[PDB]
């Protein structure tokens, strides 16, 4: 014979059971990735905003401290504040590199706030909560669903010759 | 034993992607440092000539550029810190060891893609490589 003993119905039944479950996980995973994308966009914009704002404040204060010197406890208090700003500024800049591989210029160019920063920060919290409420996410299910579904479709729509 | 092979293959794929990620991240950092330093050099020169043109006193446009010049310096310093702290590298070390294979913007897209592919592997057990090599 030129035919096959194994019926395609068997593999189809084995796969059909797998389609819908993977579809659910994949739909959850895509939703997660969408919220993650939104979160990242807002966080990059906030980071660039905070860097420019904080550097501006630190620059100004550092100039006033140095201007006053050239002219004791009060002075020390300002220097402590300068130190705190410097640590925070360094952290923000290094965060930009480590988390996004973006320069400040690159971040600002592509992502700027479209609301006041506090509104953006609240938005960040709300997106994080939404992500958290998705529970356990299986990212691999997106690719796994694609493979299983395409295979199932291939065999289904051509079962007559399989 | 087969559930091990799966686990071990995942672990090795994880290691390979992390190497891939590191190379593009450091290559970009070295590239960005040199580009930023060039922009800083260009702007600093431009600031100087403005003070020579005269009448720039109290100019808010000149002040904006001076603040920008300062922010560039702080960013450069922090990029150098990042190389030291994260990879124990100097700028020249990073540049010489890690060269971009593509244009910078495509590399930036690649960074996010590799990170996602890594995250897609889920929880990785590196020790599965060991107990797999043990079954043989």
Author numbering:
A (entry chain A): 184 to 254, 921 to 1011
B (entry chain B): 202 to 257, 919 to 998
Question: What do the paper's sentences say?
Answer:
Multi-subunit SMC complexes control chromosome superstructure and promote chromosome disjunction, conceivably by actively translocating along DNA double helices. SMC subunits comprise an ABC ATPase “head” and a “hinge” dimerization domain connected by a 49 nm coiled-coil “arm. The heads undergo ATP-dependent engagement and disengagement to drive SMC action on the chromosome. Here, we elucidate the architecture of prokaryotic Smc dimers by high-throughput cysteine cross-linking and crystallography.
